[PDB]
Amino acid sequence: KRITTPYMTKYERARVLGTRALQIAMCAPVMVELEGETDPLLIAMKELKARKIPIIIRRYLPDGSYEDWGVDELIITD
Amino acid sequence: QGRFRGNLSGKRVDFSGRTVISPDPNLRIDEVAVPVHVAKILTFPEKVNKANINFLRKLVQNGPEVHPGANFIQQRHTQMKRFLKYGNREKMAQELKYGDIVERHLIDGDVVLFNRQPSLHKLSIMAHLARVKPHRTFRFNECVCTPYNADFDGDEMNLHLPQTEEAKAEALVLMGTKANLVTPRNGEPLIAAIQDFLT
Amino acid sequence: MFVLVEMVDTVRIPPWQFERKLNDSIAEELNKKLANKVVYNVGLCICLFDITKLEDAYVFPGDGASHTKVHFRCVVFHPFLDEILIGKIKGCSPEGVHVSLGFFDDILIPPESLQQPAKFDEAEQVWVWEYETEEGAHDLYMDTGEEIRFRVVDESFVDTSPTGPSSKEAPYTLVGSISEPGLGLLSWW
Amino acid sequence: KEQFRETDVAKKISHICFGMKSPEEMRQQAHIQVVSKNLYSQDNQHAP
Amino acid sequence: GVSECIIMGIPMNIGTGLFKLLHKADRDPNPPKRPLIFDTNEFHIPLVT
Amino acid sequence: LKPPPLFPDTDYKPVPLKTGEGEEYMLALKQELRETMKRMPYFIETPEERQDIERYSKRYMKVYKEEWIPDWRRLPREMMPR
Amino acid sequence: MEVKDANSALLSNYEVFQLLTDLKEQRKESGKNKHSSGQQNLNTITYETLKYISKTPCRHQSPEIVREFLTALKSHKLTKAEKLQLLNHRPVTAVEIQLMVEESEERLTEEQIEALLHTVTSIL
Amino acid sequence: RGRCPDCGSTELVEDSHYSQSQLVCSDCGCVVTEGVLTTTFSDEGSTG
Amino acid sequence: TEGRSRDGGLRLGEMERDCLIGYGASMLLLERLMISSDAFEVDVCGQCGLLGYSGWCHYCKSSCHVSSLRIPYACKLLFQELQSMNIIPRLKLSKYN
Ligand SMILES: [Mg+2]
Ligand SMILES: [Zn+2]
Ligand SMILES: [Zn+2]
């Protein structure tokens, strides 16, 4: 059974927002509706608050094992 | 000056500037106001897509003269770098395809770093939110002055502007002023009120 | 001639295509990449037979496209020794008769593979054969092709790779045989 | 007809391996020898 | 070492470089095989001694 | 200016061979033996592998071989030829 | 890319023809996207193979035909090569089988040959 | 380069807004749509 | 280049490469130091482990072993620099996964 913390760390927030912003900048599918938005990163933060992002982080332990957690499934906070 | 300590760890950089600083209390504690004559020079290589298309048409109509304007275009279907001094620009607003590149100026609300030279500790470099104003010197709120230890005696400040989304995001989330109020040494708070507020 | 082969590979899908199931997109792309090519050791591929493994879809810093590793299975054209074949005549030369299946064309049949009683022509390009007492000492074939029968007896792979700093052969060829007793003119046999 | 070509392979450095070269290895690496003490033509063109 | 990474120009280990991202992609692993009929051991068990 | 040739000339030239009969016989016996003893099962070439498809020709022109017979009382335990 | 096995399996002409038939089933069932000439290349190769394979005798065979043939001709001392190539030929005379059967007279006899010929001619 | 994106440019000249090096071209009142960064010397230290 | 007299932009000494690590950002550091500044691409041959050019290894006299990498130009300079002193940094290449 998963052992790592159930919260998302600063670094995970940063990288997931970054990569989803890169994706959204291109024509990748989008799920949250947008109020005239124009910047990728704002779309990214909107979705993250909506927990709509299609990503799974695969945390690595030092010995090669790993866990997976759903971004929609971690504990999130401002 | 040798190889390593020269151009391996000390590599120089472009998309940057330098200028004098002066106070401006009437802004928030998370914005730095760049001068207009610098916002025409640092440019962001945006990528046009379904959502943002029409805005960038508005920019490309302008040319390099009006502040919100652009300087170069690069195209998906051919990777040439047209220069907006030339040509009937409005047509090139129509010719855009998703995946093309347009190099826009700085626009109000763009993540931009900021720095003071004699780095001593983590906080000597931060990530503000940009704004444009007609004078010729970097202006920001004075509460942030203790971290930098800057004093408006005639100092110089550098400035950078990243070029890839993931880098932009890391600059905002980690290096934002609002996430770095306490110093990481002992938990003391540094960003606070100053002379003439304390009175 | 048609033979199955087992493959593995890694492939990416640009980030403007996640709107569709990955199995389908990997099918298209993997097809497009192999499409109508020779493999150095096994010859001309036709198409995939089926996929069997779709490893997880990684994403990499600076690239929006996901990256995935695959196990899959493909069909390739490899005739094996002495095997009996049917092919259109592709042409003629003193070095041998030319043969093709329309979709594939790299077959030759030299005079040693030709039937015995005659092994040269009237010096005209078309091969004209002879028999001992019957037959008109002239029977021949035509380039646009009759589907003749032949036995594969030799092959060759040749490296068409480039050499030296950057900036007539074909990689894969076969040899057939028609001289066997009971074999020869298709109008006759 | 065409033989399949690997267009590219995404690659990454694994290790550096420091070591010496022999006189014969040095020959094999070189493109040309240089056997002259002078560098330019004596003419006006200053050609190498 | 991270210093090496600065020398070599590739992302470091610590920080946001420490973990990986997998796409939440519409994917079926080990999808049903395409059958074949020509070959089975029942047909092709060798006849040699 | 112009680097010399790869092979500079030589004033001397190698002494010619001396003729000798029993030595020439030996010369002949050398080229005979080097081709002869390669048959001895101490010599090894690659084992047979990678046949196309079972064709009863392989039954008729089959290759014959039987495992070697070293001295089982002189080498360490694992010496069994298999 | 790597090849785990370049000699994974042989196949009967119907197997590839069956694949070709189901492949032409979806022929241009997608939209008029016209992505690249690779579309044209695969169309050319597949259509030309199908069209030529249409000229082969093994057209219109059936899976149960194949399997029942295999079971029927199991006892005739044949090799995999003989079995598969014969299924790929459907012969009509004893001349060509001697071409196909190595050491024919040392192994078989004309009555077995006739039984095989009748069975293959009728079944396929 | 040489051309503008497609048509009849063949010449190259320098121009630049701000501390840069871009290759003016003169079939389009353009910069060969390319530019290249000049490389130069100094901060160290007629024939023999 | 150097500075304002000759159009040199800015310098980012070691003491800011330290703060970037302090925060722990990685893509920012990578960008700022090799993408934006002086990114360049080079070619190597896996078989011998030496550098080449234009898709060809002059050492091995072969084509099937060369490949192209990204690299900070300063480090390519350094690899061409050591060899003069007969210290040869041979390379072993690997899959990117
Ligand atoms: Mg001061
Ligand atoms: Zn023109
Ligand atoms: Zn090499």
The CATH number of whichever domain residue C25 belongs to comes to 3.30.1490.120
C105, two tokens:
């064309």
Q: Do chains A and E meet with 3 or more Cβ pairs nearer than 8 Å?
A: yes
- Indicate whether C61 and C95 sit together in one domain: no
D3 touches chain C (CB under 8 A): yes
- Indicate whether C126 and C56 sit together in one domain: no
Resolution of the experimental model, in Å, one decimal: 4.1
Contact state of H19 with I7 under an 8 Å Cβ cutoff = yes
E5 touches chain B (CB under 8 A): no
Domains contained in chain A, number: 1
- Indicate whether C22 and C105 sit together in one domain: no
Minimal Cβ distance to E21: which of A11, A14, A57: A57
> How long a stretch of residues is chain G?
124
Task: List chains touching F (3+ CB pairs under 8 A).
Answer: C, D, E, G
Confirm or deny that H28 is annotated as ligand binding.
yes
Contact state of G15 with E44 under an 8 Å Cβ cutoff = no
Query: How many angstroms separate the CA atoms of G25 and G45, rounded?
Result: 16
d(CA B42, ligand 2 centre) in Å: 30
Confirm or deny that H30 is annotated as ligand binding.
no
On whether residue C187 sits in a domain, the answer given is no
- Where is the domain boundary, C57, C77, C97? C77
Rounded to the nearest 5°, which phi and psi values hold at I22?
Answer: -45, -60
Query: How many angstroms separate the CA atoms of B178 and C72, rounded?
Result: 51
Helix (H, G, I), strand (E, B) or coil at F63: coil
- Indicate whether C46 and C104 sit together in one domain: no
Residues whose Cβ atom is located within 5 A of ion ligand 2: H 7
Confirm or deny that B116 is annotated as ligand binding.
yes
On whether residue C63 sits in a domain, the answer given is yes
- Where is the domain boundary, C77, C112, C143? C77
On whether residue C26 sits in a domain, the answer given is yes
Which residue bears the tokens 């998963």? A2
User: Containing H/E element for A18?
Assistant: helix A10-25
Cβ atoms of B84 and B18 closer than 8 Å = no
Query: How many angstroms separate the CA atoms of G19 and G27, rounded?
Result: 12
Cβ atoms of C175 and C154 closer than 8 Å = yes
Residues of B in contact with A21 (CB under 8 A): 165-166, 168-169
Confirm or deny that B5 is annotated as ligand binding.
yes
- Indicate whether C33 and C122 sit together in one domain: no
Residues facing residue H23 across a β-bridge: H14
Ligand nearest to the CA of H5: 2
Q: Dihedral of CA C122/C127/C129/C135: which sign?
A: negative
Residues of H in contact with I7 (CB under 8 A): 19-20
Measured at the CA of B172, the angle between CA B166 and CA B174, to 5 degrees, comes to 95
Minimal Cβ distance to C35: which of G7, G38, G81: G38
- Indicate whether C44 and C97 sit together in one domain: no
Cβ atoms of C37 and C44 closer than 8 Å = yes
On whether residue C89 sits in a domain, the answer given is yes
Domain range for C139: 83-181
- Which experimental method was this entry solved with? cryo-EM
Ligand nearest to the CA of I65: 3
On whether residue C31 sits in a domain, the answer given is yes
Cβ atoms of C158 and C170 closer than 8 Å = yes
- The CATH number for C137's domain is 2.40.50.140
Contact state of B119 with I19 under an 8 Å Cβ cutoff = yes
Q: Min CA distance, E30 vs chain C (Å)? A: 5
Neighbours of C103 (CB within 10 A): 19
Chain D residue nearest residue F4, CA to CA: D35
- Indicate whether C21 and C56 sit together in one domain: yes
Residues of G in contact with E43 (CB under 8 A): 67, 70-71, 74, 83
Chain I interface with H: residues with Cβ < 8 Å: 1-2, 6-7, 9
Straight-line distance from the first to the last Cα atom of chain G, in angstroms, rounded to the nearest whole number = 39
- The CATH number for A41's domain is 3.90.940.10
Query: How many angstroms separate the CA atoms of A75 and A44, rounded?
Result: 18
Domains contained in chain C, number: 2
**Which of these, C93, C90, C117, lies nearest to C181 by C-alpha position?**
C117
Contacts of residues G8-11 at CB distance under 8 Å and 24 or more positions apart, as own/partner, are G8/C3, G8/C4, G8/C5, G8/C6, G8/C73, G9/C3, G9/C4, G9/E36, G9/E39, G10/C3, G10/C4, G10/E38, G10/E39, G10/F53, G10/G80, G10/G84, G11/C2, G11/C3, G11/C4, G11/C75, G11/E36, G11/E38, G11/E39, G11/G84
3-state SS of H1-24 is CCCCCCCCCCCCEEECCCCCCEEE
Cβ atoms of B151 and I42 closer than 8 Å = no
Chain E residue nearest residue C65, CA to CA: E23
Portion 64-83 of G in contact with C at CB < 8 A = 81
Query: How many angstroms separate the CA atoms of C105 and H39, rounded?
Result: 54
Neighbours of B69 (CB within 10 A): 21
Q: Min CA distance, A59 vs chain C (Å)? A: 13
Domain range for A64: 1-78
Q: Dihedral of CA B82/B85/B88/B90: which sign?
A: positive
Confirm or deny that B14 is annotated as ligand binding.
no
D40 touches chain H (CB under 8 A): yes
On whether residue C7 sits in a domain, the answer given is yes
Helix (H, G, I), strand (E, B) or coil at H30: strand
Query: How many angstroms separate the CA atoms of C136 and C124, rounded?
Result: 16
- Indicate whether C53 and C110 sit together in one domain: no
> How long a stretch of residues is chain B?
199
Query: How many angstroms separate the CA atoms of C40 and B148, rounded?
Result: 64
What's the DSSP call for residue G24?
H
Query: How many angstroms separate the CA atoms of A29 and C19, rounded?
Result: 6
Q: Which amino acid is at I64?
A: C
On whether residue C188 sits in a domain, the answer given is no
* C-alpha radius of gyration, chain C, whole number: 23
Cβ atoms of B23 and B152 closer than 8 Å = yes
d(CA I64, ligand 3 centre) in Å: 9
**Which of these, B77, B78, B60, lies nearest to B69 by C-alpha position?**
B60
Query: How many angstroms separate the CA atoms of G103 and G91, rounded?
Result: 18
Cβ atoms of I10 and B158 closer than 8 Å = yes
Residues of I in contact with B5 (CB under 8 A): 14
- Indicate whether C32 and C91 sit together in one domain: no
E18 touches chain C (CB under 8 A): no
- Indicate whether C160 and C96 sit together in one domain: yes
On whether residue C189 sits in a domain, the answer given is no
Q: Min CA distance, I97 vs chain C (Å)? A: 9
Ligand nearest to the CA of H29: 2
Minimal Cβ distance to C58: which of E22, E26, E28: E22
**Which of these, H27, H22, H21, lies nearest to H5 by C-alpha position?**
H27
Q: Min CA distance, G121 vs chain C (Å)? A: 18
Q: Which amino acid is at C177?
A: S
3-state SS of chain C is CEEEEEEEEEEEECCCCCCCCHHHHHHHHHHHHHCCCEECCCEEEEEEEEEEEECCCEECCCCCCEEEEEEEEEEEECCCCCCEEEEEEEEEECCEEEEECCCCCCEEECHHHCCCCCCCCCCCCCCECCCCCCCCCCCECCCCCCEEEEEEEEEEECCCCCCCCCCCCCCEEEEEECCCCCCCCCCCC
Cβ atoms of B188 and B127 closer than 8 Å = no
B3, two tokens:
């190889």
- Where is the domain boundary, C61, C77, C93? C77
- Indicate whether C105 and C64 sit together in one domain: no
What's the DSSP call for residue B143?
G
- Indicate whether C34 and C66 sit together in one domain: yes
Q: Min CA distance, G63 vs chain E (Å)? A: 7
Q: Dihedral of CA C4/C8/C13/C19: which sign?
A: positive
Ligand nearest to the CA of I59: 3
Chain G residue nearest residue F54, CA to CA: G79
Minimal Cβ distance to H28: which of B64, B81, B87: B87
Straight-line distance from the first to the last Cα atom of chain H, in angstroms, rounded to the nearest whole number = 39
What's the DSSP call for residue I59?
T
